[PDB]
């Protein structure tokens, strides 16, 4: 579901709600068209009508994602949904909660105001009010006249509202939808949604009935105001105290009242402004340029750039886009973030393999630099590694790049908290024909295990540079039979995670024995394979 992830968006939303409430209050309180109506109804008319105006906008804001899904189904296509990082996910729920609570507050105000209004309306019908109210209410009993008091039946003040709320539309639906709202809010409480889902998701589907009842709810135009045509003829400010001679004199013809227009839509302004503000926020956040901070060299062609950009969330295991207008004005190249979160730079490792990369050497001399533009951090996250106890890392060929992101990030969390780091040891196993042009990673391995030795610890270590074919080098295939057993016997109930990165030729060779090794019960030895998924 959509969200804004911005304090500016929240502020503009609150401002829009306040503005809508004030504007509709003034619109229904000031004009002389709603003179007799508000005279009979006190101040409850505006206090009851403005919250409905705000509630329509808030309810549409709630419902919008379902309309988006329906439109996507109609088109026959569907835009690729964004990934989850547990931060872009657990901030939309906050917005959902705030919108739901504001809907509840406005519904409470509207219900209280109309509950107050109905009492006066049914009290004025009977001979139990001031003379002006009872004189006004006794309209429409004859022909060629339209009523103003909707309680067109004299029973009593108590039990009169009970009959009114049942025999009259928009009163039964009001009760039905307020019960639905109460049930929806109560069902989604904590200790009911977290612990259970058969009673949260199933009951939360009362929103269809709630929305149907709301759509039916506004109809029959029960609240009536003086018609524009008859307003000029009536000349209200003169024929106001002559309540007892209406119709029987020429200057004061009997006024006629009609309901509100049945299709006006002035509240869309809200959803429209919120959308435009979100889009402008996205524009600002993406216009800022990127400034190169540190550029370094490496053996052969492994030039690495470190740049700082405002308002960037590196995350982990993602990929960004790089574009140099000097080399070409219409090309975006993808690269993998070889860095860690809570840092400042990017550290994207590029190696000359073609011509555009060489465009950063001849055009951008190394012995006053091109303006690099970075698009954003797309791609699915990789956080299951940080949520495990023991890990089984196995790289391969050119594809060890993303592992450098994890290693530079696991140690940082240790120096900060040293309690949430549930990792035990990185069983890193690097397989390659040669390390000819990957010296930037082998350097990192000795700069991590040795560096972290200062705090009197050698828990992970396990640098295992291995040679497949033609510095503990196996000089051959690292056979996996009995390899995992020796380390799986240390901790019962093994949750070892293996993250392969290589061709499918050796991929299925790892899961063939994993199922065989497993046995029933929450005690046996088993390592889970994620296959092509990381």
């Amino acid at each position: 579901v959509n969200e804004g992830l911005s304090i500016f968006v929240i502020l503009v939303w609150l401002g829009l709600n306040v503005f809508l409430f004030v504007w509709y209050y003034r619109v229904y309180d000031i004009p002389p068209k709603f003179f007799y109506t508000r005279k009979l109804l006190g101040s409850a008319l505006a206090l009851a009508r403005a919250p409905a105006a705000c509630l329509n906008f808030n309810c549409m804001l709630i419902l919008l994602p379902v309309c988006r899904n329906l439109l996507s189904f109609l088109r026959g296509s569907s835009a690729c949904c964004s990934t989850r990082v547990r931060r872009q996910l657990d901030r939309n729920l906050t917005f959902h909660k705030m919108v739901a609570w504001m809907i509840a507050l406005h519904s409470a105000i509207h219900t209280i105001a109309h509950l107050f209004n109905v009492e006066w309306c049914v009290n004025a019908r009977v001979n139990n009010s001031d003379p002006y109210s009872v004189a006004l209410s006794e309209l429409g009993d004859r022909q060629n006249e339209s009523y103003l008091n909707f309680a067109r039946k004299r029973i009593k003040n108590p039990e009169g509202g009970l009959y009114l709320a049942v025999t009259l539309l928009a009163g039964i639906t009001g009760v039905v939808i307020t019960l639905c709202l109460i049930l929806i809010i109560t069902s989604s409480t904590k200790t009911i949604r977290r612990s259970y889902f058969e009673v949260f998701w199933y009951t939360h589907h009362l929103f269809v009935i709630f929305f149907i009842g709301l759509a039916i709810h506004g109809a029959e135009r029960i609240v009536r105001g003086q018609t524009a045509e008859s307003l000029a003829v009536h000349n209200i400010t003169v024929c106001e105290q002559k309540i007892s001679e209406w119709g029987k004199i020429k200057e004061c013809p009997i006024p006629q009242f009609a309901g509100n227009p049945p299709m006006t839509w002035k509240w869309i302004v809200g959803p429209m402004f919120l959308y435009l503000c979100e889009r402008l926020v996205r524009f600002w956040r993406s216009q800022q340029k990127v400034v190169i901070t540190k550029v370094v060299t490496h053996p052969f062609k492994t030039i690495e750039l470190q740049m700082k950009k405002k308002g960037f969330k590196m995350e982990v295991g993602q990929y960004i886009f790089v574009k140099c207008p000097k080399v070409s004005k219409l090309e975006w190249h993808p690269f993998t973030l070889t860095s860690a979160p809570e840092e400042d730079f990017f550290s994207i490792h590029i190696r000359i393999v073609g011509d555009w990369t060489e465009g950063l050497f001849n055009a951008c001399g190394c012995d006053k630099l091109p303006k690099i533009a970075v698009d954003g951090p797309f791609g699915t996250a990789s956080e299951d590694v940080f949520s495990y106890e023991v890990v089984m890392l196995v790289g391969a060929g050119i594809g060890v790049t993303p592992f450098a992101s994890i290693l530079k990030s696991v140690w940082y969390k240790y120096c900060n908290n040293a309690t949430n780091l549930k990792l035990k040891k990185i069983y890193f196993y690097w397989l390659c024909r040669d390390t000819h042009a990957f010296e930037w990673f082998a350097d990192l391995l000795q700069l991590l295990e040795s560096q972290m030795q200062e705090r009197n610890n050698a828990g992970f270590l396990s640098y295992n540079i291995y040679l497949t074919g033609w510095q503990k080098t196996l000089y051959g295939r690292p056979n996996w039979d009995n390899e995992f057993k020796t380390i799986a016997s240390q901790h019962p109930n093994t949750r070892i995670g293996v993250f392969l990165c290589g061709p499918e030729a050796l991929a299925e060779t790892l899961s063939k024995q994993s199922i065989s090794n497993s046995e029933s019960g929450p005690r046996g030895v088993h390592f889970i394979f994620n296959k092509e998924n990381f």
Epitope: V238, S244, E245, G247, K248, E251
Partner: antibody, heavy 121, light 111 residues
């Protein structure tokens, strides 16, 4: 429940006069009109101007527009002011209350006696 | 703008007879009439209002009926001390009018 007015006598042509109508037992309040009429000596009754106790709405006959002014003072006195008197206005003047009966229909009850306004040189 | 006239100017009826007076307007006034009786002395006294109802203390002999633009008053049981002048007034239009009080009738006792 009884009205009474006075303040008219022989005046020279072209002058101005004011007649005041007072009542005992009646409070000039509510929504009952106050309605001034006059009658020529031995002729039919004529309608001059006839105001409203509530608010300040006033109405006048076509022949007596602007020349006559009606005001309500102290909630118990009503004054009619006439300007540029001629020889035609030498008639008796009545002060009457336009009671608005239940339902809407109205009548002219609780009249007051006359006041022989005469204009001559 | 609005003209209201009485059809008979002076009717004559013997004691124990009948009297009929017709007041007709120039527009459809929604039965907002009122009939007054004026003796040679005293101010005129109201008889009926609304063209059909009765005042307080008036004998039920006086009768009025009509609709639209034509209205009528019928006198039952004419007797002594009933020779006076009768007027019809319209409480409908009071912003463009000249008299709004009818013309009057001069019923007198015949003996």
């Amino acid at each position: 429940q009884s009205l009474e007015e006075s303040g008219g006598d022989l005046v020279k042509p072209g002058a101005s006069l004011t007649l005041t109508c007072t009542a005992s037992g009646i409070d000039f309040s509510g929504y009952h009109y106050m309605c001034w009429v006059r009658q020529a000596p031995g002729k039919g009754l004529e309608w001059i101007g006839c105001t409203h106790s509530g608010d300040g709405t006033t109405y006048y006959a076509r022949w007596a527009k602007g020349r006559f002014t009606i005001s309500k003072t102290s909630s118990t006195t009503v004054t009619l002011q006439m300007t540029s008197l001629t020889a035609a206005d030498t008639a008796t003047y009545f002060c009457a209350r336009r009671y608005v009966f239940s339902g809407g229909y109205s009548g002219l009850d609780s009249w007051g006696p006359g006041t022989l306004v005469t204009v001559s040189s | 703008a609005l003209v209201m006239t009485q059809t008979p100017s002076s009717v004559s009826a013997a004691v124990r007879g009948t009297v009929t007076i017709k007041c007709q307007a120039s527009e459809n006034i929604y039965s907002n009439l009122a009939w007054y009786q004026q003796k040679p002395g005293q101010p005129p006294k109201l008889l009926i209002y609304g063209a059909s109802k009765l005042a307080s203390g008036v004998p039920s002999r006086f009768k009025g009926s009509g609709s639209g633009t034509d209205y009528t008053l019928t006198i039952r049981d004419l007797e002594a001390a009933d020779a006076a002048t009768y007027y019809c007034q319209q409480f409908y239009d009071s912003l463009n009018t000249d008299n709004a009080f009818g013309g009057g009738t001069k019923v007198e006792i015949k003996r």
